[PDB]
Structure formats: C-alpha cells, structure tokens
Amino acid sequence: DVVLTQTPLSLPVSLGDQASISCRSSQRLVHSNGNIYLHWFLQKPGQSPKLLIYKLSSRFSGVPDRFSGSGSGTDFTLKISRVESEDLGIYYCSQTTHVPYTFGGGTKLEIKRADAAPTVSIFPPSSEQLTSGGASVVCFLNNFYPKDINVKWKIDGSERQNGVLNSWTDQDSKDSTYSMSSTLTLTKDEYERHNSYTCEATHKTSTSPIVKSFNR
Amino acid sequence: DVQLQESGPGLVKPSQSLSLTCTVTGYSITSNYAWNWIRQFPGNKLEWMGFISSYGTTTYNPSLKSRFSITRDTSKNQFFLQLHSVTIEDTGTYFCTREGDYWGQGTTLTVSSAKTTAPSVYPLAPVGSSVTLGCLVKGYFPEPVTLTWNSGSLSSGVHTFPAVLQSDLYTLSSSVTVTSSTWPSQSITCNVAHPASSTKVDKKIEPS
Ligand code: NA
C-alpha cells in the first residue's frame, strides 16, 4: 500500500506570509495515462475535507489562485502564497494512482499571532448538581495563544489530580486564539469538606501562574 | 451544484449489521464518476473504503478487516455503505463522495455496548468590564449534542468545547462572555438538545 508522509505535522505561519506543505510518497504515483493523481485537501474545523488541488497542480473551482501545487516523482508540495485566517486547519494529501487510495496523515496549519494570555474564570457547582450529589467546578481559559497551556487544580492549597476533564478548542480564525475548559469533579461530600477551590494556569505569557479561585 | 448528504443510525452495538446513506442531489450517480465512502477516525486519520462506479460496479480497499459493501438506488439517487458486523474500531465519521471534489458533512457512527443517556444540564453562574457564564452538559450518550445561547440569537463571544468521554459518559461545557450591563438585567438562557435521548432542555442563568 502506498504510504504518504506529510511534513511537517504542525506549521505556524504569519498572516500574509507564504506557507508550504510537503507530501512524500513511498511509491511513484505516475499512471500509465501519464498523469499523477496526487491531490490536496483542506479540512477546516468542524467541516468536512475540501478539494484544493487535484492531479498535482490543477486548481479546483472557487479555490483562490493563492493556492498552488507542484512536485517531483515522490515529493510533492502545496504552496499557500498569502496566508489568510480562513486558511487554518488540517491539510491532507491523497493518491489515487494506486488502489487502495490512501491519505497522508495531515498537517495542521496554525496562524502565527501575538502571544496572548488566557482570560480565566472559575465556576462553582450548581444547586441542581449539588442536589444530585454531584460537585463540579469549572474553569475556562479563553482566547489565549499559543496553544501550550498547563493547568493545576488545587483544593485547600494542595493539588488534586484525580477527576480532571480537559477540553481544548481548535484555533479560532476570528482572532487566531485558542480556548480551554477544565472540569474538576468530586462527590458532594468530598466537596463540602474543603473551603478553597483554586484553578491554576501556566503559560508563556506569564512566568507565573494565573490564579482564579473561590471559597465554598 | 452537486450536493451530498449522509445519514445513519448514530449508535449501534458490536456485531450489528448496518447501513449508511448518501443522498445525492443535482447530479446523477449513473451519469458519471466514482462514488466513494471515506472514513475518519479520532486522531483525524482518513481511510478510503471504496467506491461504486456509475455502472453500479464496486471497488474496495482490500487492506481492511471490516466487512462491507457498497450499493445504490438509482431512482432515489442514493448510494449506501453496508457494514456487516461492526466492531468498536469502526467508530468514526463516515463521509460520502463524488471522487474527491464533493463531500457530505458527514455522519457519526458510534459502536458501543454502552446505553443511551440523557444529560444533566447545569448552569454556571459567577461567584470587570465584561462577564462570563457557562453551561455544563454532563453524563450523556451518545453524541452529538446541541448547545445554543438565547435560541442561537446570541452567538458572539461563545465557546463550545469538544465533548470528552469518561466512563462511557460524555461531558460538554460552554462559555459565553457578555458585558456587565447585559447580565443579569437581560436573561441569558442555555439551550440543550440531545436528539439521541429525545431530550430538550433550556436553562436560564440566574445569579449567585
Ligand atoms: Na483513475
């Protein structure tokens, strides 16, 4: 089976700058008909993959001329000339010279931006939730950049590390910012047995953790 | 133009035999081209399963364990992916396609012996210049699910977070920022919909 390797995995680029994605094939993709059925897709977040370039260098309708593809035998490049925001997502190469048809592993295109620190918010368990014998504490870390971000959950000064659910959003193309949510979940008991609930965030934008808290 | 819409049963148990639908419009599946089924797994890896030619003849990925076929109905202008005994490892998002130039939104197949569960919708009200609230949809199964703010009217400064699975239960949270002068002088309600459990919940965010 034809294996396609994409380089790199991730790829930060500045607005207005030219980006290029590389795809490498474990086999020659030249058909008998003389054509190279190597194609390019972009998958925007929440969306389905979309054809950019087909047969190596042919550009699909409605696709900006900013987008171009070339390559040589077993090495292939996609060039994005003047990067805009809408352009963010996962980029895939595929081949259809050989059955079975195979896809590259994808290359995430991240937009370079002004480091930005998270806007932090801490949230106590609902009445409703409390009634059910549930206790969840929610912490949002919104509109930060870059993506790398660690959190700590402290109960009465010391650190919890059992019962933590984390979720990250894909890069917002509206402002090139990321967002995270963390939910610490305990038993209504284990909860009311402590006072202070702290949500600690680590990030490049600060040599020191960003702290948000509350007293039960 | 050519449009493709997937549909399917959503959740099913292992060993279940099953079929997915691709409904094509604006173009006949008899006319021309090859009509594909493609699969995306978590981790975002894409896998080509097969196609049905415009002649009604099929070509499959011989490198797969999954037992399947592809069929059509030229009259309703649909083609179908029939999966013969799904395993857990068949969980993923299935796309249908004309070649590679037209895709459907996609349809989620979850293969689990876990039972369907309606979620608990929880209001996160606060304890500066703007203000932040939250929705906690917990302990449902499967997905998808649906979250809006003020019936979808309010869409600015919202953050819906991908669901995360813990012990065969999903948990999903939502953020929304508004100006201090907005809340709670104006009511902000959270709008949850879980079609799978036929649940629809509306949770207004009250202070304290
Ligand atoms: Na061909």
Side-chain angles (χ1 to χ4, degrees), chain A residues 1 41 43 48-49 51 60 90 92 100-101 103 105 123-124 126 128-129 132 136 138 140 142-143 165 167-169 179-181 185, chain B residues 40 44-46 48 51 61 63 95 100-101 103-105 122-124 127 132-133 136 138 159 161-162 164 166 173-175 203:
Chain A
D1 287 13
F41 313 79
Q43 185 172 29
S48 87
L51 187 61
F60 196 56
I90 307 156
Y92 301 97
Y101 301 152
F103 298 91
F123 285 92
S126 298
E128 288 95 323
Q129 193 189 2
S132 76
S136 279
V138 191
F140 295 121
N142 291 5
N143 300 310
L165 273 62
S167 187
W168 304 259
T169 68
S179 283
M180 176 174 178
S181 173
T185 317
Chain B
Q40 200 175 43
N44 292 339
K45 297 297 169 302
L46 285 172
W48 173 79
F51 65 74
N61 190 340
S63 304
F95 299 95
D101 45 9
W103 304 53
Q105 292 300 298
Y122 290 142
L124 297 44
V127 182
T132 279
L133 326 153
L136 193 46
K138 197 185 166 208
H159 283 104
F161 297 92
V164 56
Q166 181 71 357
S173 54
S174 201
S175 158
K203 276 280 178 190

Short mmCIF file of all heavy atoms in Angstrom, two decimals, chain A residues 1 41 43 48-49 51 60 90 92 100-101 103 105 123-124 126 128-129 132 136 138 140 142-143 165 167-169 179-181 185, chain B residues 40 44-46 48 51 61 63 95 100-101 103-105 122-124 127 132-133 136 138 159 161-162 164 166 173-175 203:
data_model
loop_
_atom_site.label_atom_id
_atom_site.label_comp_id
_atom_site.label_asym_id
_atom_site.label_seq_id
_atom_site.Cartn_x
_atom_site.Cartn_y
_atom_site.Cartn_z
N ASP A 1 0.84 -1.23 0.00
CA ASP A 1 0.00 0.00 0.00
C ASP A 1 0.85 1.24 0.00
O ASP A 1 1.84 1.35 0.72
CB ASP A 1 -0.92 0.01 1.21
CG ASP A 1 -2.06 -0.97 1.08
OD1 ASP A 1 -2.00 -1.82 0.17
OD2 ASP A 1 -3.01 -0.89 1.88
N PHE A 41 -6.27 18.45 -0.09
CA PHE A 41 -7.48 18.88 0.61
C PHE A 41 -7.17 19.69 1.84
O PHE A 41 -6.10 19.58 2.45
CB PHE A 41 -8.34 17.70 1.06
CG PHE A 41 -8.56 16.66 0.00
CD1 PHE A 41 -7.57 15.73 -0.27
CD2 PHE A 41 -9.75 16.59 -0.68
CE1 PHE A 41 -7.77 14.76 -1.23
CE2 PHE A 41 -9.96 15.63 -1.63
CZ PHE A 41 -8.97 14.71 -1.91
N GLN A 43 -9.17 20.61 5.48
CA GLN A 43 -10.26 20.41 6.43
C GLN A 43 -10.23 21.48 7.49
O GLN A 43 -9.38 21.48 8.39
CB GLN A 43 -10.18 19.03 7.08
CG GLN A 43 -11.37 18.73 8.00
CD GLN A 43 -11.38 17.29 8.47
OE1 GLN A 43 -10.32 16.68 8.59
NE2 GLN A 43 -12.56 16.75 8.73
N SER A 48 -15.99 19.39 6.74
CA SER A 48 -15.58 18.19 6.01
C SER A 48 -14.45 18.55 5.06
O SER A 48 -14.34 19.70 4.64
CB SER A 48 -16.75 17.60 5.22
OG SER A 48 -16.85 18.19 3.94
N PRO A 49 -13.59 17.57 4.71
CA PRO A 49 -12.46 17.95 3.85
C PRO A 49 -12.89 18.48 2.50
O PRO A 49 -13.90 18.08 1.95
CB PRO A 49 -11.68 16.63 3.70
CG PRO A 49 -12.06 15.83 4.91
CD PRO A 49 -13.50 16.17 5.16
N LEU A 51 -11.55 19.87 -1.45
CA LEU A 51 -10.56 19.78 -2.51
C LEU A 51 -10.01 21.14 -2.88
O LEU A 51 -10.75 22.08 -3.16
CB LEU A 51 -11.17 19.11 -3.75
CG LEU A 51 -10.20 18.79 -4.89
CD1 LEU A 51 -9.11 17.82 -4.43
CD2 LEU A 51 -10.95 18.24 -6.09
N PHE A 60 -9.02 23.44 -8.25
CA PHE A 60 -10.48 23.29 -8.25
C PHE A 60 -11.19 24.64 -8.23
O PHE A 60 -10.65 25.64 -7.77
CB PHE A 60 -10.93 22.44 -7.05
CG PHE A 60 -12.33 21.93 -7.17
CD1 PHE A 60 -12.72 21.18 -8.27
CD2 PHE A 60 -13.26 22.18 -6.17
CE1 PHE A 60 -14.01 20.70 -8.38
CE2 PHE A 60 -14.55 21.70 -6.28
CZ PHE A 60 -14.93 20.96 -7.39
N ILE A 90 -6.50 21.43 8.97
CA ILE A 90 -5.68 20.27 8.62
C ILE A 90 -5.66 20.08 7.13
O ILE A 90 -6.69 20.00 6.46
CB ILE A 90 -6.19 18.97 9.26
CG1 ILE A 90 -6.36 19.13 10.76
CG2 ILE A 90 -5.23 17.82 8.94
CD1 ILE A 90 -7.36 18.17 11.34
N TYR A 92 -4.40 17.78 3.96
CA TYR A 92 -4.16 16.40 3.53
C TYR A 92 -3.80 16.28 2.09
O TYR A 92 -4.39 16.92 1.22
CB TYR A 92 -5.42 15.56 3.70
CG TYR A 92 -5.96 15.47 5.08
CD1 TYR A 92 -6.99 16.30 5.48
CD2 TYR A 92 -5.48 14.53 5.97
CE1 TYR A 92 -7.51 16.21 6.74
CE2 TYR A 92 -5.98 14.43 7.23
CZ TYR A 92 -7.01 15.28 7.61
OH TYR A 92 -7.53 15.20 8.87
N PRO A 100 -5.20 0.36 -2.87
CA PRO A 100 -6.20 1.26 -2.32
C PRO A 100 -5.74 2.70 -2.25
O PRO A 100 -4.55 2.99 -2.08
CB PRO A 100 -6.42 0.72 -0.91
CG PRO A 100 -5.15 0.07 -0.55
CD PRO A 100 -4.57 -0.46 -1.83
N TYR A 101 -6.71 3.57 -2.40
CA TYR A 101 -6.49 5.02 -2.29
C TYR A 101 -6.13 5.34 -0.85
O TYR A 101 -6.76 4.86 0.09
CB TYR A 101 -7.72 5.83 -2.72
CG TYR A 101 -8.13 5.55 -4.14
CD1 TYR A 101 -9.45 5.69 -4.55
CD2 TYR A 101 -7.18 5.14 -5.06
CE1 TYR A 101 -9.81 5.43 -5.86
CE2 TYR A 101 -7.53 4.88 -6.36
CZ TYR A 101 -8.84 5.02 -6.76
OH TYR A 101 -9.18 4.75 -8.07
N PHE A 103 -4.48 8.31 2.09
CA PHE A 103 -4.30 9.69 2.54
C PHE A 103 -3.08 9.85 3.42
O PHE A 103 -2.72 8.97 4.20
CB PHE A 103 -5.50 10.15 3.35
CG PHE A 103 -6.79 10.16 2.61
CD1 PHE A 103 -7.60 9.04 2.60
CD2 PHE A 103 -7.20 11.30 1.93
CE1 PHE A 103 -8.80 9.05 1.93
CE2 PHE A 103 -8.40 11.32 1.25
CZ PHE A 103 -9.20 10.20 1.25
N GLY A 105 -1.21 11.74 6.59
CA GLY A 105 -1.62 11.81 7.99
C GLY A 105 -2.12 13.17 8.43
O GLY A 105 -2.65 13.33 9.52
N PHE A 123 -15.72 28.51 38.34
CA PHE A 123 -17.16 28.28 38.48
C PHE A 123 -17.50 27.19 39.49
O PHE A 123 -16.97 26.09 39.43
CB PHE A 123 -17.77 27.92 37.13
CG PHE A 123 -17.91 29.10 36.21
CD1 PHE A 123 -16.91 29.42 35.31
CD2 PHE A 123 -19.05 29.89 36.25
CE1 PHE A 123 -17.04 30.50 34.47
CE2 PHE A 123 -19.18 30.97 35.41
CZ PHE A 123 -18.18 31.28 34.52
N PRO A 124 -18.40 27.50 40.42
CA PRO A 124 -18.84 26.57 41.45
C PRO A 124 -19.98 25.64 41.01
O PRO A 124 -20.73 25.98 40.09
CB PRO A 124 -19.32 27.49 42.59
CG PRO A 124 -18.90 28.88 42.21
CD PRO A 124 -18.74 28.89 40.74
N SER A 126 -23.43 23.76 40.60
CA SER A 126 -24.81 24.22 40.58
C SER A 126 -25.58 23.67 41.76
O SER A 126 -25.18 22.67 42.36
CB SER A 126 -25.50 23.81 39.27
OG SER A 126 -24.86 24.39 38.15
N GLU A 128 -28.51 22.52 41.36
CA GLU A 128 -29.07 21.34 40.70
C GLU A 128 -28.13 20.18 40.89
O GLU A 128 -28.50 19.10 41.35
CB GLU A 128 -29.27 21.58 39.20
CG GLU A 128 -30.40 22.53 38.84
CD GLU A 128 -29.93 23.96 38.65
OE1 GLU A 128 -29.02 24.40 39.39
OE2 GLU A 128 -30.47 24.64 37.75
N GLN A 129 -26.89 20.44 40.51
CA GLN A 129 -25.86 19.41 40.54
C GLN A 129 -25.61 18.97 41.96
O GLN A 129 -25.43 17.78 42.24
CB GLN A 129 -24.55 19.91 39.92
CG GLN A 129 -23.61 18.76 39.66
CD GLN A 129 -22.22 19.17 39.25
OE1 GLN A 129 -21.89 20.36 39.18
NE2 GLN A 129 -21.38 18.18 38.99
N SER A 132 -28.00 16.46 43.38
CA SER A 132 -27.90 15.10 42.81
C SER A 132 -26.76 14.35 43.46
O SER A 132 -26.57 13.16 43.24
CB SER A 132 -27.66 15.16 41.31
OG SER A 132 -26.31 15.51 41.05
N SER A 136 -19.21 19.67 40.59
CA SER A 136 -18.29 20.05 39.53
C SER A 136 -17.91 21.50 39.57
O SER A 136 -18.75 22.40 39.70
CB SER A 136 -18.86 19.71 38.16
OG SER A 136 -18.67 18.33 37.88
N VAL A 138 -15.86 24.24 37.39
CA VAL A 138 -15.46 24.54 36.02
C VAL A 138 -14.56 25.76 35.94
O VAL A 138 -14.78 26.79 36.58
CB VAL A 138 -16.68 24.75 35.11
CG1 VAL A 138 -16.24 24.78 33.66
CG2 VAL A 138 -17.69 23.64 35.33
N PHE A 140 -12.62 28.03 32.89
CA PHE A 140 -12.40 28.41 31.50
C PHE A 140 -11.13 29.23 31.35
O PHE A 140 -10.85 30.14 32.12
CB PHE A 140 -13.58 29.21 30.94
CG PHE A 140 -14.86 28.43 30.85
CD1 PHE A 140 -15.99 28.85 31.53
CD2 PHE A 140 -14.94 27.29 30.08
CE1 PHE A 140 -17.17 28.15 31.45
CE2 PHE A 140 -16.12 26.58 29.99
CZ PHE A 140 -17.24 27.01 30.68
N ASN A 142 -9.84 31.16 28.23
CA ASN A 142 -10.28 31.61 26.91
C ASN A 142 -9.34 32.57 26.21
O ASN A 142 -8.67 33.39 26.83
CB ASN A 142 -11.67 32.23 27.02
CG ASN A 142 -12.74 31.20 27.34
OD1 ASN A 142 -12.43 30.03 27.57
ND2 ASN A 142 -13.99 31.63 27.35
N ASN A 143 -9.32 32.41 24.90
CA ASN A 143 -8.72 33.39 23.99
C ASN A 143 -7.26 33.63 24.29
O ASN A 143 -6.82 34.77 24.47
CB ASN A 143 -9.48 34.71 24.05
CG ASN A 143 -10.93 34.57 23.66
OD1 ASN A 143 -11.25 34.00 22.61
ND2 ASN A 143 -11.82 35.09 24.49
N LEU A 165 -11.21 16.76 33.93
CA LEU A 165 -11.54 16.68 32.50
C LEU A 165 -11.20 17.97 31.78
O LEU A 165 -11.68 19.06 32.12
CB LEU A 165 -13.01 16.32 32.29
CG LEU A 165 -13.25 14.82 32.27
CD1 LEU A 165 -12.86 14.21 33.61
CD2 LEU A 165 -14.70 14.48 31.93
N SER A 167 -10.68 19.99 27.99
CA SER A 167 -11.04 20.13 26.58
C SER A 167 -10.54 21.42 25.97
O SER A 167 -10.72 22.51 26.52
CB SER A 167 -12.55 20.02 26.40
OG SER A 167 -12.88 19.98 25.02
N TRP A 168 -9.91 21.25 24.82
CA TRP A 168 -9.36 22.36 24.04
C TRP A 168 -10.14 22.56 22.77
O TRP A 168 -10.61 21.62 22.14
CB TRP A 168 -7.90 22.07 23.68
CG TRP A 168 -7.02 21.80 24.86
CD1 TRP A 168 -6.16 22.68 25.47
CD2 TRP A 168 -6.92 20.57 25.59
NE1 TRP A 168 -5.53 22.07 26.53
CE2 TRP A 168 -5.98 20.78 26.63
CE3 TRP A 168 -7.53 19.32 25.47
CZ2 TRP A 168 -5.64 19.77 27.53
CZ3 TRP A 168 -7.19 18.32 26.37
CH2 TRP A 168 -6.25 18.56 27.39
N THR A 169 -10.26 23.82 22.39
CA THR A 169 -10.86 24.19 21.12
C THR A 169 -9.78 24.27 20.05
O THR A 169 -8.60 24.46 20.34
CB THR A 169 -11.60 25.54 21.17
OG1 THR A 169 -10.66 26.61 21.36
CG2 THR A 169 -12.62 25.55 22.29
N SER A 179 -8.75 28.24 23.10
CA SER A 179 -9.58 28.21 24.31
C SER A 179 -9.69 26.82 24.94
O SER A 179 -9.80 25.80 24.26
CB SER A 179 -10.98 28.77 24.03
OG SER A 179 -10.96 30.19 23.96
N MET A 180 -9.66 26.83 26.26
CA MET A 180 -9.73 25.60 27.04
C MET A 180 -10.74 25.65 28.16
O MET A 180 -11.13 26.70 28.66
CB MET A 180 -8.37 25.28 27.64
CG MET A 180 -8.41 24.06 28.54
SD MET A 180 -6.79 23.58 29.12
CE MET A 180 -7.23 22.21 30.18
N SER A 181 -11.16 24.46 28.52
CA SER A 181 -12.08 24.24 29.62
C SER A 181 -11.62 23.07 30.45
O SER A 181 -11.22 22.03 29.93
CB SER A 181 -13.49 24.00 29.08
OG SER A 181 -14.39 23.62 30.11
N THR A 185 -14.26 17.25 39.02
CA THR A 185 -15.48 16.63 39.54
C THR A 185 -15.23 15.75 40.74
O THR A 185 -14.41 14.82 40.71
CB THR A 185 -16.22 15.86 38.45
OG1 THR A 185 -16.22 16.63 37.25
CG2 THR A 185 -17.65 15.58 38.87
N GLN B 40 -13.19 8.73 8.66
CA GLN B 40 -12.29 9.48 9.53
C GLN B 40 -12.41 9.05 10.96
O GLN B 40 -13.47 9.15 11.56
CB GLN B 40 -12.54 10.98 9.45
CG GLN B 40 -11.35 11.80 9.94
CD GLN B 40 -11.54 13.30 9.76
OE1 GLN B 40 -12.60 13.84 10.04
NE2 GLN B 40 -10.49 13.97 9.30
N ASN B 44 -8.01 11.93 13.61
CA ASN B 44 -8.27 12.62 12.33
C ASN B 44 -7.79 11.89 11.09
O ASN B 44 -7.89 12.42 9.98
CB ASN B 44 -7.69 14.03 12.33
CG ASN B 44 -8.42 14.95 13.29
OD1 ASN B 44 -9.57 14.69 13.66
ND2 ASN B 44 -7.76 16.03 13.70
N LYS B 45 -7.28 10.69 11.28
CA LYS B 45 -6.81 9.85 10.16
C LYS B 45 -7.94 9.41 9.25
O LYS B 45 -8.97 8.90 9.69
CB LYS B 45 -6.03 8.63 10.64
CG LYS B 45 -4.75 8.98 11.39
CD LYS B 45 -3.74 9.71 10.51
CE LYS B 45 -2.59 10.27 11.35
NZ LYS B 45 -3.06 11.22 12.43
N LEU B 46 -7.69 9.64 7.96
CA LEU B 46 -8.64 9.35 6.87
C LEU B 46 -8.32 8.05 6.18
O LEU B 46 -7.16 7.73 5.89
CB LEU B 46 -8.64 10.49 5.83
CG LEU B 46 -9.36 11.79 6.19
CD1 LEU B 46 -9.08 12.84 5.13
CD2 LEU B 46 -10.86 11.57 6.35
N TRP B 48 -9.85 5.43 3.02
CA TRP B 48 -10.73 5.13 1.88
C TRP B 48 -11.17 3.69 1.90
O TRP B 48 -10.35 2.75 1.92
CB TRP B 48 -10.05 5.43 0.54
CG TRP B 48 -10.86 4.98 -0.65
CD1 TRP B 48 -11.93 5.61 -1.20
CD2 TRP B 48 -10.64 3.80 -1.43
NE1 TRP B 48 -12.40 4.90 -2.28
CE2 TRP B 48 -11.62 3.78 -2.44
CE3 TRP B 48 -9.71 2.76 -1.38
CZ2 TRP B 48 -11.70 2.77 -3.39
CZ3 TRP B 48 -9.79 1.76 -2.33
CH2 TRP B 48 -10.77 1.77 -3.32
N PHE B 51 -15.52 2.61 -3.59
CA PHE B 51 -16.49 3.32 -4.42
C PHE B 51 -17.35 2.39 -5.25
O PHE B 51 -17.05 1.21 -5.47
CB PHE B 51 -15.83 4.35 -5.34
CG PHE B 51 -14.92 3.76 -6.40
CD1 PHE B 51 -15.45 3.10 -7.49
CD2 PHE B 51 -13.55 3.89 -6.30
CE1 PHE B 51 -14.62 2.57 -8.46
CE2 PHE B 51 -12.71 3.36 -7.27
CZ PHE B 51 -13.25 2.69 -8.35
N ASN B 61 -11.28 -1.43 -0.69
CA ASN B 61 -9.98 -1.43 -0.02
C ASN B 61 -9.67 -2.82 0.54
O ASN B 61 -10.25 -3.22 1.55
CB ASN B 61 -9.95 -0.40 1.10
CG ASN B 61 -8.56 -0.19 1.68
OD1 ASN B 61 -7.68 -1.04 1.52
ND2 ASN B 61 -8.38 0.92 2.36
N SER B 63 -7.23 -3.96 2.02
CA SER B 63 -6.34 -3.90 3.19
C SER B 63 -7.09 -3.68 4.49
O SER B 63 -6.51 -3.26 5.49
CB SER B 63 -5.31 -2.79 3.01
OG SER B 63 -4.59 -2.98 1.81
N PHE B 95 -17.81 9.72 5.61
CA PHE B 95 -18.10 10.66 4.52
C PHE B 95 -18.39 9.95 3.23
O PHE B 95 -17.80 8.92 2.91
CB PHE B 95 -16.92 11.59 4.28
CG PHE B 95 -16.56 12.44 5.44
CD1 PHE B 95 -15.59 12.04 6.33
CD2 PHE B 95 -17.20 13.65 5.65
CE1 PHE B 95 -15.25 12.84 7.41
CE2 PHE B 95 -16.87 14.45 6.72
CZ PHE B 95 -15.90 14.04 7.60
N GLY B 100 -13.44 13.08 -5.29
CA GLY B 100 -12.86 13.79 -4.15
C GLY B 100 -13.21 15.26 -4.10
O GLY B 100 -12.75 15.99 -3.24
N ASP B 101 -14.08 15.66 -5.01
CA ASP B 101 -14.33 17.06 -5.26
C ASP B 101 -15.61 17.52 -4.59
O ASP B 101 -15.88 18.71 -4.48
CB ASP B 101 -14.37 17.36 -6.76
CG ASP B 101 -15.17 16.34 -7.54
OD1 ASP B 101 -15.84 15.49 -6.90
OD2 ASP B 101 -15.12 16.39 -8.78
N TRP B 103 -17.95 16.47 -1.08
CA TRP B 103 -18.16 15.73 0.16
C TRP B 103 -19.43 16.14 0.88
O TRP B 103 -19.92 17.26 0.77
CB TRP B 103 -16.98 15.96 1.10
CG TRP B 103 -15.66 15.60 0.52
CD1 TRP B 103 -15.14 16.04 -0.66
CD2 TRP B 103 -14.66 14.74 1.09
NE1 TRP B 103 -13.89 15.51 -0.87
CE2 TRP B 103 -13.57 14.70 0.20
CE3 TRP B 103 -14.58 14.00 2.27
CZ2 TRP B 103 -12.43 13.95 0.45
CZ3 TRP B 103 -13.44 13.26 2.52
CH2 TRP B 103 -12.38 13.24 1.62
N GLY B 104 -19.95 15.19 1.63
CA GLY B 104 -21.04 15.45 2.58
C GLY B 104 -20.47 15.99 3.87
O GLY B 104 -19.26 16.01 4.08
N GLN B 105 -21.37 16.43 4.72
CA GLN B 105 -20.99 16.96 6.03
C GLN B 105 -20.31 15.85 6.78
O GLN B 105 -19.25 16.00 7.37
CB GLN B 105 -22.22 17.40 6.82
CG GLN B 105 -22.95 18.61 6.23
CD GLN B 105 -22.06 19.85 6.15
OE1 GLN B 105 -21.58 20.37 7.18
NE2 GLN B 105 -21.83 20.35 4.93
N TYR B 122 -26.45 21.85 33.50
CA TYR B 122 -26.08 22.58 34.70
C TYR B 122 -25.68 24.01 34.38
O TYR B 122 -24.84 24.25 33.51
CB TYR B 122 -24.93 21.86 35.40
CG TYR B 122 -25.36 20.55 36.01
CD1 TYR B 122 -24.52 19.44 35.98
CD2 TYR B 122 -26.59 20.43 36.63
CE1 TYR B 122 -24.90 18.25 36.55
CE2 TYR B 122 -26.99 19.23 37.20
CZ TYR B 122 -26.14 18.14 37.16
OH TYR B 122 -26.52 16.95 37.72
N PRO B 123 -26.28 24.96 35.10
CA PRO B 123 -25.99 26.38 34.91
C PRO B 123 -24.83 26.86 35.74
O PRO B 123 -24.83 26.72 36.97
CB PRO B 123 -27.27 27.06 35.37
CG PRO B 123 -27.81 26.15 36.43
CD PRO B 123 -27.40 24.74 36.02
N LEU B 124 -23.85 27.42 35.05
CA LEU B 124 -22.70 28.02 35.71
C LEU B 124 -22.83 29.52 35.78
O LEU B 124 -22.58 30.22 34.80
CB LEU B 124 -21.41 27.65 34.98
CG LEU B 124 -21.09 26.15 34.98
CD1 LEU B 124 -22.34 25.33 34.67
CD2 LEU B 124 -19.99 25.85 33.98
N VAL B 127 -19.35 33.76 40.67
CA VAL B 127 -19.25 33.80 42.12
C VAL B 127 -19.55 35.20 42.65
O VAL B 127 -20.64 35.47 43.15
CB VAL B 127 -17.86 33.38 42.63
CG1 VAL B 127 -17.84 33.41 44.15
CG2 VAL B 127 -17.47 32.00 42.10
N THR B 132 -18.77 36.54 32.20
CA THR B 132 -18.69 35.19 31.66
C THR B 132 -19.59 34.21 32.39
O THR B 132 -19.58 34.12 33.62
CB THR B 132 -17.24 34.66 31.71
OG1 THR B 132 -16.51 35.17 30.59
CG2 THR B 132 -17.23 33.15 31.66
N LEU B 133 -20.39 33.49 31.61
CA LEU B 133 -21.18 32.38 32.13
C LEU B 133 -20.84 31.08 31.42
O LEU B 133 -19.90 31.01 30.62
CB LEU B 133 -22.68 32.64 31.99
CG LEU B 133 -23.11 34.10 32.16
CD1 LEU B 133 -24.39 34.38 31.38
CD2 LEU B 133 -23.28 34.46 33.63
N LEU B 136 -22.92 23.40 31.65
CA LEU B 136 -22.33 22.09 31.87
C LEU B 136 -23.33 21.00 31.54
O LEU B 136 -24.23 20.72 32.32
CB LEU B 136 -21.85 21.95 33.32
CG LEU B 136 -20.94 20.74 33.58
CD1 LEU B 136 -19.87 20.61 32.51
CD2 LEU B 136 -20.33 20.83 34.96
N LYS B 138 -23.67 17.23 31.20
CA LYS B 138 -22.92 16.10 31.75
C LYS B 138 -23.64 14.77 31.63
O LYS B 138 -24.86 14.67 31.74
CB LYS B 138 -22.59 16.37 33.22
CG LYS B 138 -21.48 15.49 33.79
CD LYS B 138 -21.28 15.71 35.28
CE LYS B 138 -20.44 14.59 35.89
NZ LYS B 138 -20.76 14.38 37.34
N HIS B 159 -18.05 30.05 23.41
CA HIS B 159 -17.08 28.97 23.32
C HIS B 159 -17.66 27.63 23.74
O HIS B 159 -17.80 27.33 24.92
CB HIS B 159 -15.84 29.28 24.16
CG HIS B 159 -14.91 30.27 23.54
ND1 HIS B 159 -14.83 31.58 23.96
CD2 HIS B 159 -14.01 30.14 22.53
CE1 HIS B 159 -13.92 32.21 23.24
NE2 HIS B 159 -13.41 31.36 22.37
N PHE B 161 -17.07 23.75 23.86
CA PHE B 161 -15.91 22.88 23.96
C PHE B 161 -16.25 21.44 23.57
O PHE B 161 -17.30 20.92 23.91
CB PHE B 161 -15.33 22.94 25.38
CG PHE B 161 -14.82 24.31 25.75
CD1 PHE B 161 -15.64 25.23 26.39
CD2 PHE B 161 -13.52 24.68 25.43
CE1 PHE B 161 -15.16 26.49 26.72
CE2 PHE B 161 -13.05 25.94 25.75
CZ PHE B 161 -13.87 26.84 26.39
N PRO B 162 -15.34 20.80 22.82
CA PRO B 162 -15.49 19.41 22.45
C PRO B 162 -15.79 18.52 23.63
O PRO B 162 -15.20 18.67 24.70
CB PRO B 162 -14.12 19.06 21.87
CG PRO B 162 -13.58 20.34 21.37
CD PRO B 162 -14.11 21.40 22.28
N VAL B 164 -15.93 15.25 26.01
CA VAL B 164 -14.89 14.33 26.49
C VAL B 164 -15.50 13.18 27.26
O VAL B 164 -16.33 13.37 28.14
CB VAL B 164 -13.84 15.05 27.37
CG1 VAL B 164 -14.51 15.75 28.54
CG2 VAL B 164 -12.80 14.06 27.86
N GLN B 166 -15.84 10.04 29.68
CA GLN B 166 -15.38 9.46 30.94
C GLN B 166 -16.37 8.40 31.40
O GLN B 166 -17.50 8.70 31.78
CB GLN B 166 -15.23 10.55 32.00
CG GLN B 166 -14.75 10.05 33.36
CD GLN B 166 -13.29 9.63 33.34
OE1 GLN B 166 -12.63 9.66 32.30
NE2 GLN B 166 -12.77 9.24 34.51
N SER B 173 -19.02 21.37 28.05
CA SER B 173 -19.18 22.69 28.66
C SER B 173 -19.17 23.80 27.62
O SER B 173 -18.58 23.69 26.55
CB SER B 173 -18.09 22.95 29.70
OG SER B 173 -16.80 22.77 29.15
N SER B 174 -19.87 24.87 27.97
CA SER B 174 -19.96 26.05 27.10
C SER B 174 -19.77 27.35 27.85
O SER B 174 -20.28 27.57 28.95
CB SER B 174 -21.29 26.09 26.36
OG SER B 174 -21.18 26.90 25.20
N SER B 175 -19.02 28.20 27.18
CA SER B 175 -18.67 29.54 27.65
C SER B 175 -19.33 30.60 26.80
O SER B 175 -19.59 30.41 25.60
CB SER B 175 -17.14 29.73 27.63
OG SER B 175 -16.79 31.10 27.59
N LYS B 203 -31.99 26.14 30.09
CA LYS B 203 -31.50 26.58 31.40
C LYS B 203 -31.06 28.02 31.37
O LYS B 203 -30.02 28.38 30.83
CB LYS B 203 -30.36 25.70 31.88
CG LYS B 203 -30.81 24.44 32.58
CD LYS B 203 -31.22 24.69 34.02
CE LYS B 203 -31.72 23.40 34.68
NZ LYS B 203 -32.36 23.64 36.00
#
